[PDB]
Design an enzyme around this catalytic site. Sequence first.
Site, PDB file in Angstrom:
ATOM      1  N   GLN G  11       6.010  14.825   2.022  1.00 59.79           N
ATOM      2  CA  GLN G  11       5.532  15.978   2.820  1.00 59.79           C
ATOM      3  C   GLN G  11       4.684  15.432   3.967  1.00 59.79           C
ATOM      4  O   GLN G  11       4.894  15.854   5.124  1.00 59.79           O
ATOM      5  CB  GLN G  11       4.684  16.947   2.001  1.00 59.79           C
ATOM      6  CG  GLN G  11       4.873  18.409   2.390  1.00 59.79           C
ATOM      7  CD  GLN G  11       3.607  19.227   2.277  1.00 59.79           C
ATOM      8  OE1 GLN G  11       3.615  20.453   2.434  1.00 59.79           O
ATOM      9  NE2 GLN G  11       2.502  18.553   2.001  1.00 59.79           N
ATOM     10  N   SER G 140       3.251   8.560   1.383  1.00 59.98           N
ATOM     11  CA  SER G 140       2.003   9.141   0.833  1.00 59.98           C
ATOM     12  C   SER G 140       1.750   8.539  -0.554  1.00 59.98           C
ATOM     13  O   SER G 140       2.393   9.002  -1.514  1.00 59.98           O
ATOM     14  CB  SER G 140       2.089  10.627   0.764  1.00 59.98           C
ATOM     15  OG  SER G 140       3.221  11.030   0.006  1.00 59.98           O
ATOM     16  N   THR G 145       7.194  11.716  -3.887  1.00 54.68           N
ATOM     17  CA  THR G 145       8.176  11.195  -2.917  1.00 54.68           C
ATOM     18  C   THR G 145       7.608   9.980  -2.229  1.00 54.68           C
ATOM     19  O   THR G 145       8.248   8.909  -2.303  1.00 54.68           O
ATOM     20  CB  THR G 145       8.527  12.289  -1.915  1.00 54.68           C
ATOM     21  OG1 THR G 145       8.907  13.408  -2.710  1.00 54.68           O
ATOM     22  CG2 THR G 145       9.677  11.896  -1.006  1.00 54.68           C
ATOM     23  N   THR G 179      -6.168  15.482  -4.041  1.00 62.10           N
ATOM     24  CA  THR G 179      -5.352  16.705  -4.160  1.00 62.10           C
ATOM     25  C   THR G 179      -4.717  16.755  -5.530  1.00 62.10           C
ATOM     26  O   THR G 179      -4.241  17.844  -5.918  1.00 62.10           O
ATOM     27  CB  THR G 179      -4.315  16.673  -3.041  1.00 62.10           C
ATOM     28  OG1 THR G 179      -5.078  16.741  -1.841  1.00 62.10           O
ATOM     29  CG2 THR G 179      -3.337  17.833  -3.092  1.00 62.10           C
ATOM     30  N   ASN G 206      -7.496  10.336   4.137  1.00 62.57           N
ATOM     31  CA  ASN G 206      -7.734  11.692   4.702  1.00 62.57           C
ATOM     32  C   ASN G 206      -9.234  11.905   4.918  1.00 62.57           C
ATOM     33  O   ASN G 206      -9.613  12.305   6.040  1.00 62.57           O
ATOM     34  CB  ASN G 206      -7.116  12.767   3.817  1.00 62.57           C
ATOM     35  CG  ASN G 206      -5.825  13.287   4.393  1.00 62.57           C
ATOM     36  OD1 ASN G 206      -5.423  12.862   5.481  1.00 62.57           O
ATOM     37  ND2 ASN G 206      -5.162  14.192   3.688  1.00 62.57           N
ATOM     38  N   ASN G 228      -3.380  14.678  11.844  1.00 61.48           N
ATOM     39  CA  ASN G 228      -2.040  14.049  11.987  1.00 61.48           C
ATOM     40  C   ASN G 228      -1.823  13.636  13.444  1.00 61.48           C
ATOM     41  O   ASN G 228      -0.886  12.855  13.705  1.00 61.48           O
ATOM     42  CB  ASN G 228      -0.931  14.962  11.478  1.00 61.48           C
ATOM     43  CG  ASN G 228      -0.820  14.946   9.973  1.00 61.48           C
ATOM     44  OD1 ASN G 228      -1.563  14.222   9.302  1.00 61.48           O
ATOM     45  ND2 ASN G 228       0.093  15.734   9.426  1.00 61.48           N
ATOM     46  N   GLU G 254       4.619  -9.435  15.552  1.00 59.72           N
ATOM     47  CA  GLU G 254       3.411 -10.260  15.788  1.00 59.72           C
ATOM     48  C   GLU G 254       2.345  -9.905  14.745  1.00 59.72           C
ATOM     49  O   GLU G 254       1.629 -10.825  14.302  1.00 59.72           O
ATOM     50  CB  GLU G 254       2.900 -10.023  17.206  1.00 59.72           C
ATOM     51  CG  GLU G 254       1.379  -9.927  17.308  1.00 59.72           C
ATOM     52  CD  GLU G 254       0.807  -8.564  16.959  1.00 59.72           C
ATOM     53  OE1 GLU G 254       1.610  -7.618  16.851  1.00 59.72           O
ATOM     54  OE2 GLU G 254      -0.420  -8.445  16.770  1.00 59.72           O
TER      55      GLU G 254
HETATM   56  N1  LIG Z   1      -2.965  12.396   5.549  1.00 57.73           N
HETATM   57  C1  LIG Z   1      -2.133  13.381   5.227  1.00 57.73           C
HETATM   58  N2  LIG Z   1      -1.600  13.448   3.957  1.00 57.73           N
HETATM   59  C2  LIG Z   1      -0.755  14.450   3.622  1.00 57.73           C
HETATM   60  C3  LIG Z   1      -0.411  15.412   4.556  1.00 57.73           C
HETATM   61  N3  LIG Z   1       0.438  16.279   3.965  1.00 57.73           N
HETATM   62  C4  LIG Z   1       0.645  15.885   2.689  1.00 57.73           C
HETATM   63  N4  LIG Z   1      -0.099  14.759   2.458  1.00 57.73           N
HETATM   64  C5  LIG Z   1      -0.157  13.983   1.206  1.00 57.73           C
HETATM   65  O1  LIG Z   1       0.730  14.513   0.239  1.00 57.73           O
HETATM   66  C6  LIG Z   1       0.197  14.324  -1.053  1.00 57.73           C
HETATM   67  C7  LIG Z   1       0.612  15.467  -1.970  1.00 57.73           C
HETATM   68  O2  LIG Z   1       2.002  15.443  -2.213  1.00 57.73           O
HETATM   69  P1  LIG Z   1       3.007  16.313  -1.311  1.00 57.73           P
HETATM   70  O3  LIG Z   1       2.253  16.981  -0.190  1.00 57.73           O
HETATM   71  O4  LIG Z   1       3.715  17.348  -2.145  1.00 57.73           O
HETATM   72  O5  LIG Z   1       4.066  15.260  -0.716  1.00 57.73           O
HETATM   73  P2  LIG Z   1       5.145  14.481  -1.620  1.00 57.73           P
HETATM   74  O6  LIG Z   1       4.994  12.990  -1.459  1.00 57.73           O
HETATM   75  O7  LIG Z   1       6.524  14.927  -1.208  1.00 57.73           O
HETATM   76  O8  LIG Z   1       4.896  14.934  -3.144  1.00 57.73           O
HETATM   77  P3  LIG Z   1       6.003  15.751  -3.979  1.00 57.73           P
HETATM   78  O9  LIG Z   1       6.310  17.070  -3.318  1.00 57.73           O
HETATM   79  O10 LIG Z   1       5.488  15.993  -5.377  1.00 57.73           O
HETATM   80  O11 LIG Z   1       7.262  14.923  -4.047  1.00 57.73           O
HETATM   81  C8  LIG Z   1      -1.311  14.263  -0.885  1.00 57.73           C
HETATM   82  O12 LIG Z   1      -1.837  13.178  -1.610  1.00 57.73           O
HETATM   83  C9  LIG Z   1      -1.545  14.048   0.594  1.00 57.73           C
HETATM   84  O13 LIG Z   1      -2.232  12.841   0.800  1.00 57.73           O
HETATM   85  C10 LIG Z   1      -0.944  15.351   5.836  1.00 57.73           C
HETATM   86  O14 LIG Z   1      -0.650  16.201   6.671  1.00 57.73           O
HETATM   87  N5  LIG Z   1      -1.807  14.332   6.168  1.00 57.73           N
HETATM   88 MG   LIG Z   2       7.401  16.719  -1.665  1.00 55.91          MG
END
Ligand SMILES: Nc1nc2c(ncn2[C@@H]2O[C@H](COP(=O)(O)OP(=O)(O)OP(=O)(O)O)[C@@H](O)[C@H]2O)c(=O)[nH]1
Ligand SMILES: [Mg+2]
Lengths: 50, 50, 426, 426, 48, 440, 440
Positions: G11, G140, G145, G179, G206, G228, G254
């Site tokens: 995400q 992330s 994912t 989170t 974050n 972002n 580099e």
């Molecule tokens: N820095 C930052 N982290 C984000 C942002 N959006 C989502 N995340 C990260 O996403 C993590 C939560 O999981 P998801 O948002 O569902 O993303 P994902 O990797 O697809 O996880 P799943 O849906 O369970 O597969 C958090 O630990 C956040 O750090 C963002 O806009 N900025």
């Molecule tokens: Mg996801």
Amino acid sequence: PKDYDIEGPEEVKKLCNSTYRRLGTSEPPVWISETREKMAQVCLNKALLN
Amino acid sequence: QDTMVQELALANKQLLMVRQAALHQLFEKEHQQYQQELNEKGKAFYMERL
Amino acid sequence: MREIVHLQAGQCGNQIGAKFWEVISDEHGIDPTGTYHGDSDLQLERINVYYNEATGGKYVPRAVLVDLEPGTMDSVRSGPFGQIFRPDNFVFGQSGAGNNWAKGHYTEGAELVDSVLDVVRKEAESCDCLQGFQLTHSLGGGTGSGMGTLLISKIREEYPDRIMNTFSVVPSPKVSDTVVEPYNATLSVHQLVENTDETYCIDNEALYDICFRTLKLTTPTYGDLNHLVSATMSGVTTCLRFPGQLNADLRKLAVNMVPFPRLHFFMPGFAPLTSRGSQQYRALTVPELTQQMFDAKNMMAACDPRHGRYLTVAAVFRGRMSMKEVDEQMLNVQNKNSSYFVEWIPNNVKTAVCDIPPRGLKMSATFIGNSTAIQELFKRISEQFTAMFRRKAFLHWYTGEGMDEMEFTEAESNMNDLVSEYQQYQ
Amino acid sequence: MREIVHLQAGQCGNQIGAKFWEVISDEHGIDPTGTYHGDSDLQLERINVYYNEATGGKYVPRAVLVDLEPGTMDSVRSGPFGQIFRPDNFVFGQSGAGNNWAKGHYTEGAELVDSVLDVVRKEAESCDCLQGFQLTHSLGGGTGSGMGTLLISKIREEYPDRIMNTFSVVPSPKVSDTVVEPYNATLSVHQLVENTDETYCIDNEALYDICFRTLKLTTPTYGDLNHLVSATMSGVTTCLRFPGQLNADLRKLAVNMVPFPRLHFFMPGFAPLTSRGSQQYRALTVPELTQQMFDAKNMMAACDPRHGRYLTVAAVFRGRMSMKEVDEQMLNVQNKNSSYFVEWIPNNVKTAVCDIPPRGLKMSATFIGNSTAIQELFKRISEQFTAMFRRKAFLHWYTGEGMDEMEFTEAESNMNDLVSEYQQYQ
Amino acid sequence: FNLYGIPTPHFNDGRNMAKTLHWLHELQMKRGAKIVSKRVDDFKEKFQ
Amino acid sequence: MRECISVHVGQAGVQIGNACWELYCLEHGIQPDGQMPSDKTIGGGDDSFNTFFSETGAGKHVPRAVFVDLEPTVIDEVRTGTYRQLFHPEQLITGKEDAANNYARGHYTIGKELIDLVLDRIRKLADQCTGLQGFLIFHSFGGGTGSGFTSLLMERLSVDYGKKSKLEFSIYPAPQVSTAVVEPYNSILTTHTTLEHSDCAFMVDNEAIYDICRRNLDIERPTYTNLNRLIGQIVSSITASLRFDGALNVDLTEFQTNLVPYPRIHFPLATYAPVISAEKAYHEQLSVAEITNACFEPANQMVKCDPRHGKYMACCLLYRGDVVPKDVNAAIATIKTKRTIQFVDWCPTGFKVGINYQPPTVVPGGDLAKVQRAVCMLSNTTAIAEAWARLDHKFDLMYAKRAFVHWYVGEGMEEGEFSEAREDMAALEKDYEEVGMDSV
Amino acid sequence: MRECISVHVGQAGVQIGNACWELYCLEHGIQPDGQMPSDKTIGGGDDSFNTFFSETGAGKHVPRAVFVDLEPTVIDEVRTGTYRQLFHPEQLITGKEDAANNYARGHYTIGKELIDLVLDRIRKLADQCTGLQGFLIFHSFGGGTGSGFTSLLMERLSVDYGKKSKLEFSIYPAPQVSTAVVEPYNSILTTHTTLEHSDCAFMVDNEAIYDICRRNLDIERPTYTNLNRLIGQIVSSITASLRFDGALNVDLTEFQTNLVPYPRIHFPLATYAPVISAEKAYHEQLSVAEITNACFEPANQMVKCDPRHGKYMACCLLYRGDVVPKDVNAAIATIKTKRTIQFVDWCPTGFKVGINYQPPTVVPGGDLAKVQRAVCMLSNTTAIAEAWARLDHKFDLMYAKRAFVHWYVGEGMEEGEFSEAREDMAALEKDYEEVGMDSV
Ligand SMILES: Nc1nc2c(ncn2[C@@H]2O[C@H](COP(=O)(O)OP(=O)(O)OP(=O)(O)O)[C@@H](O)[C@H]2O)c(=O)[nH]1
Ligand SMILES: [Mg+2]
Ligand SMILES: Nc1nc2c(ncn2[C@@H]2O[C@H](COP(=O)(O)OP(=O)(O)OP(=O)(O)O)[C@@H](O)[C@H]2O)c(=O)[nH]1
Ligand SMILES: Nc1nc2c(ncn2[C@@H]2O[C@H](COP(=O)(O)OP(=O)(O)O)[C@@H](O)[C@H]2O)c(=O)[nH]1
Ligand SMILES: Nc1nc2c(ncn2[C@@H]2O[C@H](COP(=O)(O)OP(=O)(O)O)[C@@H](O)[C@H]2O)c(=O)[nH]1
Ligand SMILES: [Mg+2]
């Protein structure tokens, strides 16, 4: 300010019905995500001897 | 082209310094015969501590 | 796409389920006829999760209407949104549940589970990808505790990989409107320990007190009482329906919550309750939202978090917010209040953020929380059962129906095992 | 080069300090948006003194504005020239100081010290050769006198080779604008004398008597006697930034005027003072101008020059003027009133001439003095202190938040120490 | 509802002092230039 | 910024709120609904409301007040009156049965049943506020909740908050009239627990307000609505520097440090000078040089004494509107020269001034003409001891034979506090005469 | 053709990418539609869009990206938002079910049923390139994912594109804010598998960016699309030399040679420089020196970890705009004299400079102003250990109770992996210790 009333002057008092259509009255005018509103901002918008 | 936004600016400098000098002559020469014409009708400019 | 299936059994789950689609038809924009009348394309895109499609734009709800007496069927169809319900999803017997677990699960139950499973199998094969089922009932009743628990067993065996929700109205401590509540609820939870992945225990006067002290009306109805219950089960599947910047579905809401297979019985809760005289007098913001969210006077089951402590909690969020205060006012409940959280789980909160608030509000949040405080919801229902099963109170109505007396012994044999695994982290 | 950094403490320093910034953005030519719109290149000749170049041709003025409330800065940040400043320098507290030392110098003073001395520091070595520090405050109220005096102690420790200029506002003789002043005056001067090099003892009432007598204005407000101080204040440092045939920075004025480190007590003045109706009735030349430079009614301290023999005198001039008319005329002054000077100094007067007059003027000048009558300013404060210290009148708010009684006695002993060191030099 | 009590014209920001510290001899030179007689001009080039 | 909440306890306290909050509604364009007047509603334009108002986001400005009183009859006519839409419906709390002019009932019997509601409500005002500068406790001295409740109310506010300022603009028992017989009992007891906690008061009576209405204003037969309005004019002037930027700001923190000489002497006046009808100010030219003289004049001020022997010792003058500092200074330098308004010689400073840039406002339905300038004066004097030991002398007549005591000791009260009031009371009158003439 | 295929998984990756790609469609004038507003500039250059935007028949400047997720909810926005006609139909891939914050689904179930398709699209994109400098990744280290599918890819990619810069950019678990309760596990799991499959990992947290967007850009309450933007300015200043030109030019090959010291310690913390709102900037000096000093501050750092508790082993100062080589040199000399900043002994040098000539691009609607000079210092500090240790403490705090494992073993991952990774991360921590010890 009740939408439906249970103590009102009506005849049939349906207890299964709620008295309030909503939890509050202040829905946001437009319904837009942040990933839209924000990313949808790109749109928005001498010399004397030349 | 990036030279040309810099080319026109320095060309404006040349015109600027050649019209200030010419207007300097006109203003001093006008002021002297402004004094001369007034001196014939019995008037003159006030110079501070004249 | 991302379809989930809603079930309900008995008149308790029917008044829950009828009000639950009062508010989603309001949310997506479905009129009391069946046609679309909303103002945004967002509430027509992922409508596949609850509303199916029919010729003429007729979005049909996705349920199986289960009861044993037809009087609630007339109550549903004659309601304000009862026209949209599909008519052959109304599956109904002709003999009542008896307010009994026994004939609701063994004799009159078994005569209709085939007719319920057939329309469940019919519906669940028309979707592309199914997440899981969702059922609302009462443990103190006869249909929901008797047949609804059997339907939980049947659809779990057929679909093992799918997730399960139950929204069980657990019996109330102080007031009792059914004498056989300690009998009808101690056998249905016997199957809830293994056949369910998520359980949201809901007390009845935990709705009465909140509707009195917060919604602030001296005369509540069942619909206002069911309104709070319908809010969180719509709030649980928020990001499953609507977009957002941090999206969590029902399964992602399961993995981050329970650390053990059997400790999966939860505490629901809805944060933004004011009353409508003071909607214009109070400034609604996240620090005021999360304060009333974790305040236990706003708890949707009659348990006190002061007696135990939370294992993990979750809070998914609505509306157009920021992320600094769904972290600064969310670490503050952990750091400043550290003795009310278990120390073997370092973090304790799932945060999920949506963009779309419910129809009516700008910014909302719902609360679900695992706790040790659920132990005394089962202690007392033990004490209600142990003091009553010992002198063979009503077993002749149960052992004369087709199950032996020894099946009752296993009821508290694993209810006390739920406790021993609840009490071990206390 | 010879740049000085400005400091404004309290509300009183926040208008007379601010009014300097319209005066000097008048004089250097800086428009209130921040850019340059002038006529002469000698204006941007030494802009490095009071301003620092920011980005793309604007000159943000360097100044550290310190106050305990943001509302006095609400009239400064939202003034005509509030958006020439930088917002990072707008450092302030949250709650009130309320004219107390132990609240403005000890409890709430010390909290804001770290947030003021860092932006004083990080702005100080951004330049190459620091000349000195330039305060602007009052002595009546402890919100600025409390903070400004402490800011002296922490600047003089790490900047011992810099010149201290403080624009103190001493209390008026007849009537007060604050009942607790004689505590605030002695507790200021007790280490203001030992830690500063230049203090200007201007009171409000002499500024009033100027506006009634030698200006003929019937209702000029606080925005008018501020311009009288501010335009005078530019001429003190006019030789830093404007060329002249005899330059004099703040510091060779410092070396010349004070003989002994107990005497940092100066009186300013300004030479073109007269009414709109009395303009053509007057000759603007230095034989007709240095008289009012030495007149009693153009003194900003309400101290009688007949009572006070001038110890050392600095006369800094503006415009194209002769130098024999600076020197021969100044002894011509000294001849008729030789008794009302001191005779152990062969030349009581220091002269300096600049070549640039202000706007609307053809020739101007301004005055810096050091007279015998500044003693009577200090005995009157001691008279208003001992009568108020005998019964410990307002002492219980100083003792209330962390100040010892003996510091009042040490200040009063130092207070009369200045009186005794000053009468022996007579 | 009328303006009661003496109106005293005041100017809180303080432009009154800036007008009287402007020396109304070049206010006329900003708004023009003086025209004096020739025989104060010719006299004063001799004895001042 | 610079906010300070108000508390209106007692009937006198809440009915001043039934007249003071009219004044703030007419100042910052707040209609009785609580909003900008539909039209003239810009996106956002001030922070001047913030001292006594707070946003709800949408545009309604809920006031920063706490309405508590044990009589709900005085609370219902603002619940069903013109201002039913202004106040938050939950901050405005009532009791069941009134304290009935007993200090025992306001601090021991029924006061205890409502302490939890007010202190829970006051702390959410404090949590919502970012920087709090004072407490505006509006409380009389006669009744059982005007006097008994505020003794327990600010006792809890002085331990949970501490260094916050306390303010009062309310009604003191009149020396010659009264509306209750137990007023010398309630006022003699509520002073015991409000010495080291309270830092302001209103020592003069309300028949001086009868005198100003009848004899300064051209009104005959004045009424409590007119009295409550004139007191509300002064609360706006003491808080005029917290909303409106003036020549030199005088906020709430140095009302503390300047007007109390000693920590048991915390009694400033309340004198609004231009209490002038429309019928006289058309006839009369009002200057700032005379409005301070009129404020010091025995006519226009409500100082219940003979100001021939009014010995002022810590003065504070606050100006609103068309004022200049010199004609403040020329009038205030003339007044120290001028002899029979006798001042303290050992306080050569004496005065402090405050100047605001906003002209004084007027409410429709009143007799005051909108003046271009007004002055408010709070001076701590030692002439109160004439009106102070006399109220003690009012208590001594009933002290000997124990009249009305059986309602106290019969319903939750010890008899010792009737004595322990007296010596602390005699010590306070000892303090006032001690600062008289020791320096001659 | 210095091309660079960018892979945004999770995400976060997608959201982060949407923002990052707005900057790219602005640096080079590529109308949010596909066509370049008929013009010739420093972006229209065939050799300035090729680095990212692929050319077509009718100027359909396609992105060379591949946004991947498992829950359609997120990439449906990039498919029904402003930039819908850009991202080629199947360049943005989605599934049907998420990974439910669990590495197992992301690596041994929900992931497997997709890697094939994704890899195929990267093969197609690679074929179109002529010099794939690198495969920039954005995941992330917390969700199923960005921890699971991201791992699967890095592995499969290794045995398909082989030695080809696989630079990373993940949101490593924050210090206090979090989170999920199932991140301790996922994080310590992904690193163990990606450690020997990643070249560099420009990490970022974050919480840090949040404070940065409150201490500097005073955007009090910040959303994700706000953090972002600066998590995307780093990607531009990192990949700017492969597009716009300048004096010294650094490449995506580099960093690995100038930052990563040993084949395991590849986690360079990141920090930008001129982070000033377009309202507090103008009034200030943003000169090479100040911007450089600002980066080496123990706060502007975009990872909640203080360098003063560790040693620097390699710093890459990437500048941009009107930067003068001379000033840079003098500025770097000063940051060497300072003794509050310490460099390890086995790195006598430790400064990699780079000066692109293109000034920072202003996104239409953002906190950042329109500056002229900027820096982006990537630093391999030994202060990333303090972080890894806290993540380890968390993993053990729960693994003891074998908690939150039921749904990790029953998804494929044998219980063994937990230990394998746990022990390996313990080696990383011990590794960092020796690497620091000053040479003997
Ligand atoms: N820095 C930052 N982290 C984000 C942002 N959006 C989502 N995340 C990260 O996403 C993590 C939560 O999981 P998801 O948002 O569902 O993303 P994902 O990797 O697809 O996880 P799943 O849906 O369970 O597969 C958090 O630990 C956040 O750090 C963002 O806009 N900025
Ligand atoms: Mg996801
Ligand atoms: N100016 C003004 N004074 C009032 C008003 N109403 C009441 N008062 C004064 O308040 C006093 C009333 O007595 P209190 O002791 O305050 O009565 P209370 O506060 O209601 O206490 P309880 O009666 O016991 O509930 C009277 O003596 C009046 O002088 C008013 O509306 N305006
Ligand atoms: N929450 C909620 N509970 C209800 C409602 N109506 C009935 N109940 C509960 O249902 C219980 C009785 O269950 P019963 O009617 O025998 O259930 P059934 O046998 O499954 O139909 C009572 O204890 C009620 O508390 C409702 O509208 N909302
Ligand atoms: N010269 C001058 N003095 C002022 C002005 N405004 C206020 N003051 C002084 O401020 C003093 C009041 O003290 P106060 O303002 O409370 O000082 P603070 O507590 O340090 O902020 C009075 O003595 C005035 O002389 C002004 O515009 N000019
Ligand atoms: Mg009453």
